Write a protein that binds this ligand. Structure first.
Ligand SMILES: C[C@]1([C@@H]2C[C@H]2C(=O)Nc2cccc3cc(Cl)cnc23)N=C(N)OCC1(F)F
Ligand code: NA
Ligand code: NA
Length: 384
């Protein structure tokens, strides 16, 4: 409890390509890098020689593979994959010293799924069985882990973002506990509303302390989730409209093209001259543990302005605006998570946030987690 030195710094990534952990599958163990995804519930790995892949799961080499004689076709909004289901022995080398028999979807065909130039070959869906494909009878990895070992039913994530000049991203996934070296101040917990996605309820939104004053149901239409497998902070369309109006206003001392705010074009500045100060902070108040009690998390432009390094057309420091409109509810992606140490306390059906010891900031502002606040009618903020 509280100290897991073997798991610190077990995440790696490249800016724009997500955060992955080393895993092994099969006997003898085959090493793969696997994207950590709290927004899905399947363990799915490349199993055929797709040209984008560094390596792939070769079931024929594993003496412990067991075929489930069942396939799955998984379409996303953009892109898809098709796989064959089976079980095999799975371990996390820089994780708990255990090996479990887990479901594995061996990906045999995919479209717009793997990233050309990335260093990961599969995804680890850490959410609940309700959203597993093809149905909720396919036990997710973490459920198998907890069922088969003495690993406590919780994990925590510290995602450490980037800044010019481009160095790799990194962080820590603490499996079965919390490492108190990874955050400062106190953890504040918000309830997991329902165990499918890691669904939470946002009760108030501010831009530089200025309340959007929308009906709070709007903030969670049709859900709000914590998702390490999405870059952006995605906001419901109506909320995005209000938020971006407020952000434009706060930053009006400089004018940027309309397309910038829509993520249709980059903005660039001469190296080292990014005007962080003109951009507002963004605060989400989350439902607390106690009736009529909330707490607030606050992120900086350092989180929501993403550095884009691979721009052969330009010579400067270029950025993408990574708050975007949603039709799937609020998505608290890497833009939120990079500010915080996030504790997925499954045992107690709650998510903890604390200020990350690694988050990107400046001399004037830092990410924050603050409470308690008094917030009435928070139950009305959930969409039904
Ligand atoms: C299944 C799925 C795939 C696995 C997600 C994915 O590929 N994510 C990413 C792709 C590219 C750059 C990224 C950067 C960061 Cl920081 C995170 N994820 C990144 N999971 C979620 N949660 O939402 C999208 C999805 F398709 F449903
Ligand atoms: Na157990
Ligand atoms: Na601490």
């Amino acid at each position: 409890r509280g100290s897991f030195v073997e798991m610190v710094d077990n995440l790696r990534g490249k800016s724009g390509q997500g955060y992955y952990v080393e895993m092994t599958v099969g006997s003898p163990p085959q090493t793969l890098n696997i994207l950590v995804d709290t927004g899905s519930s399947n363990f799915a790995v490349g199993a055929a020689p797709h040209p984008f892949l560094h390596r792939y799961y070769q079931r024929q080499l594993s003496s412990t593979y067991r075929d489930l004689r069942k396939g799955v076709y998984v379409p996303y909004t953009q892109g898809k994959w098709e796989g064959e289901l089976g079980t095999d022995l799975v371990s996390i080398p820089h994780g708990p010293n255990v090996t479990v028999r887990a479901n594995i979807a061996a990906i045999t065909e995919s479209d717009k799924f793997f990233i050309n130039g990335s260093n990961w070959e599969g995804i680890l869906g850490l959410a609940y069985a309700e959203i597993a494909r093809p149905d909720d009878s396919l036990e997710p990895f973490f459920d198998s882990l907890v069922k088969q070992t003495h690993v406590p039913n919780l994990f925590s994530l510290q995602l450490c973002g980037a800044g010019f000049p481009l160095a790799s991203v990194g962080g820590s996934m603490i499996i079965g506990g919390i490492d108190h070296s990874l955050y400062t101040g106190s953890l504040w917990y918000t309830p997991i509303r329902r165990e499918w996605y890691y669904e939470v309820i946002i009760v108030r939104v501010e831009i530089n302390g200025q309340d959007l004053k929308m009906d709070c149901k709007e903030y969670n239409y049709d859900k709000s989730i914590v998702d390490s497998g999405t870059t952006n902070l995605r906001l419901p369309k109506k909320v995005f409209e209000a938020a971006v109006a407020s952000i434009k206003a706060a930053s009006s001392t400089e004018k940027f093209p309309d397309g910038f705010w829509l993520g249709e074009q980059l903005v660039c500045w001469q190296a080292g001259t990014t005007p962080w100060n003109i951009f507002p902070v963004i605060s989400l108040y989350l439902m607390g543990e106690v009736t009529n009690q909330s707490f607030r998390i606050t992120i900086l432009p350092q989180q929501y302005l993403r550095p884009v390094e691979d721009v052969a057309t330009s010579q400067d420091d270029c950025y993408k605006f990574a708050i975007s409109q949603s039709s799937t509810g609020t998505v608290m992606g890497a833009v939120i998570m990079e500010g915080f140490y996030v504790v997925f306390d499954r045992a107690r059906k709650r998510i903890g946030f604390a200020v990350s010891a690694c988050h990107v900031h400046d001399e004037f502002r830092t990410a924050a987690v603050e409470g308690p606040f008094v917030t009435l009618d928070m139950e009305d903020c959930g969409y039904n």
